[PDB]
Structures are given as structure tokens and as C-alpha cells.
Amino acid sequence: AVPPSLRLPVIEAAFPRQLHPYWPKLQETTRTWLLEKRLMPADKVEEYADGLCYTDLMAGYYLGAPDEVLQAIADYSAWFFVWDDRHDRDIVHGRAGAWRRLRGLLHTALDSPGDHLHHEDTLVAGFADSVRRLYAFLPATWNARFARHFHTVIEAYDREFHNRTRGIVPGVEEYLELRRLTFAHWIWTDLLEPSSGCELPDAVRKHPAYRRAALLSQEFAAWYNDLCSLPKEIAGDEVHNLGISLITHHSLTLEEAIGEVRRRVEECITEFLAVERDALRFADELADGTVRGKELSGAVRANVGNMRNFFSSVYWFHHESGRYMVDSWDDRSTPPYVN
Ligand SMILES: [Mg+2]
Ligand SMILES: [Mg+2]
Ligand SMILES: [Mg+2]
């Protein structure tokens, strides 16, 4: 039973969950990949890895993706989570020197993953491994776009580092622009393309309906995460959260911020439903009778479909993952899966 303050009746009724048939293998393989790359201690993987439901999230998102593509996505996503934890630990312990170097190593590895497959820092090598595999599905033009988007993500994380060390709480609009990058909105949007096995031309993917649908899907997830991860981010001295920016600047109380974030989350859903019609109508326009048009039509249709899936997958992920179960920790400021 989902708590009233986090419950979204629309998602439960209009957004039915889906699950990739490869998921059972996905869960085990990703777990093994975390062990082989040494991204987590062997006992924390045994204890927490499956309870984190990182593979569950992506398997309910990228439906119709080839197994190898889904695996690379899941491994990358798992790295993304342990990088968020390393980023958090570097801040609380004030390891600015360690962070700046890692930051630099990630930029370089992003451009040439092969050269960093066996780097001394396992976090860098784990990153290089998943990125190299992601670069093997689609032509170089896609890889370049991916790198370009993730270069921005790293800098956003660096910007987050400086804000938390100084104690600066971003403005509500300053946060919303930063949140699009720290949540990696366009990374997950790009990953839709190898999932449908097709790189979309700019004329297609920058179509207003496609753009808006992709955006709204990411905004919902990012903002619902802020709503659900709020208690664990309060206890961990995290300052990057929509609710926190409201309380700090707009002087809203703890309950006023929750309700305010809820309404923004609810708007995303109904706004998505409106543009989803336009996005799917555009998919029907692409099918002009040609083989090419048919391929582009199917890809967009599958992508928009996965944008929809994200809603249900994220929603149930925040109530099934042990990542946010702060109420069951001995030390609320230190998650047990984090080292
Ligand atoms: Mg975090
Ligand atoms: Mg973050
Ligand atoms: Mg969060």
C-alpha cells in the first residue's frame, strides 16, 4: 500500500506496469557485473543489490529492447547509482581533491572508453565498460550525442558538489534547470533509440510532440523522485530537491511543499496524456508507405510507448527499492548500501 502523500491514483489506473521478459537474467547478470567490476563490496551485493531493484526499474522502462542492449543499460544504470553514492560520500567527507580527479577521469573516459577499461579506479573502469558497450549499438553520430549529453551531466554533478559544500540552496527555477541535468533527462531519452534499434534523425526527434513527451516523462520521474527521496535527503544534508528549494526560498512548510510538489507531479501526467496523442499521431504520419517511413514510425511509436512506461516503472520503483527506506536504517544519514 502506497502512502497517501505519495499515492498517485492516475498512475495505478491509467499506467499499467510492464516487465521485460529478460528481467530474471537481467537481475543476476547485473549483480555479477557489479561483483566483477568491484563497484560494491561482495557482502553488500549479497545483502542489498537485489533489494535495490535497479534492474527492475529499467526492465519496466525499455520494453522491446534487445537483451544485450537492456543489459548494457542496466549495468550503466547500476553504475549511475553507485556514482551518486560516491559523489555523496566525497561531499560529506569533504574529498574535493578526489572528486575533481574523478570528474576529470569521467570526461576523458567518456570520449575514449576502451583506454580506461582497466583503470586503477574501479568506478572509472566500470564506467568505461558500460559506455563502450553502449557505443556499439548505433553509429558514431549517436555516440557523439550521448557523450555530449553526459559531459553536461558530469558538470551538473560538479555544480551540485560546490552547492553542498558551501551550503548553497539553489532557487526553485535554478534547481529545475539543474535537475534536468543531474537526473540525466536526455541520457534516458537517448537510450530509447538503441532500445528500438534505430537512431532518429534530428528532424524526427526534435519534433515538438516528441520533444515535449520525452521531457514530461523525465520531469515526472525527476520530480516524483524528489517527493519520494525527500526524507532520506533531509537526513543526509542533501540540498538538491524541489521540496527543499520551496521550503528555503518560498518559506513553505514541510507539508505545503509536499502538496506543491504533488501538484506539479500530477500536472506532468495529464500534460503527457495530451502530447502523447500528438506524438503518436506523428508516428502515424511517418508511415507514408515506404520501408524507411515504416521503420521511423515503429521506432517513434516504441519510444513514446517507453516514455509512458517510465511513469509506472518509476512510481513502483520508489516503493519497492530499499534505496529510499530511510525509516529502516540505524543511521538515517548513512544508507547501509553506501560505503
Ligand atoms: Mg542522490
Ligand atoms: Mg543526484
Ligand atoms: Mg533523490
Swiss-Prot record:
Binding-site residues for Mg(2+) 1, renumbered to this chain: D84, D88
Binding, Mg(2+) 3: N225, S229, E233
Organism ancestry: Bacteria, Bacillati, Actinomycetota, Actinomycetes, Kitasatosporales
Pfam annotation, one family: Terpene_syn_C_2
Protein's name in the database: Epi-isozizaene synthase
Organism: Streptomyces coelicolor (strain ATCC BAA-471 / A3(2) / M145)
Recorded domain comment: The Asp-Asp-Xaa-Xaa-Asp/Glu (DDXXD/E) motif is important for the catalytic activity, presumably through binding to Mg(2+).
Residues at which Mg(2+) 2 binds: D84, D88
Pathway(s) where this gene product acts: Sesquiterpene biosynthesis; epi-isozizaene biosynthesis
InterPro entries the record matches: Isoprenoid_synthase_dom_sf, IsozizSyn, Terpene_cyclase-like_2
